Amino acid sequence: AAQTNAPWGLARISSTSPGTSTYYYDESAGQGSCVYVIDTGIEASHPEFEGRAQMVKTYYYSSRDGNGHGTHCAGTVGSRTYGVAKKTQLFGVKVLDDNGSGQYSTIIAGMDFVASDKNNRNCPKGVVASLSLGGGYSSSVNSAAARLQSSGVMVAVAAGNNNADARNYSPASEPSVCTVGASDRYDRRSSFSNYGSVLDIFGPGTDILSTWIGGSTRSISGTSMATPHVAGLAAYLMTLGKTTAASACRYIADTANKGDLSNIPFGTVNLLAYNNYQA
């Protein structure tokens, strides 16, 4: 399949080179996979989700995404137009309030929730969790992300937007999950992207067009935007049977575009998520 005039990030993950416009992807499109978007919620009624999104848990008064961030991330995972895995099932877990903030205890509870809830869902091709959030280092947050990964979920987490070593941020610093840095359309590390040895992979994160609340769309930037590219890619690859939740991060790193990025500090991987699609 080929989506013409795709958002640059989708084109980028299906190209060895920057600057293309078509997103090439296998038509399976993550069908049969599930991605939990642990964030401010998902506006599941957005037409771009095609009924494939649903809220499954909120830690606030409403399950509504009153912010947009979660909806945006979910759209990069799996919306029709803006998504990597256009046929995946999206499950929203609202751990962040409508200002985009959440207490670590709530974020931890949301991860534990996904680890259990997935056992109630039909996800024959596997389960991914996309965590476009983070704060300062917390062993308990890291442990929750590790538990979620151990439970059989492909956990992708944002490296953070501090232009600093992700070692000091969580869940970015949890080694066992897939810690995602951000790149821009010119294959530069995004100016805000964290870096460091704990990063596993980069994905498109600067000027990412996706869904927004109110049935809208907008372009925003962050490692929060790169993370769902990787989560979606994992779902897509898991549906193709190329990898499993436990190995998807390594598989994505092994199959990434290598050395394409600039402004990567020594000791940080120079790996950009790539679907290796061949028509």
Ligand SMILES: [Ca+2]
């Ligand atoms: Ca290249």
Ligand SMILES: [Ca+2]
């Ligand atoms: Ca890792």
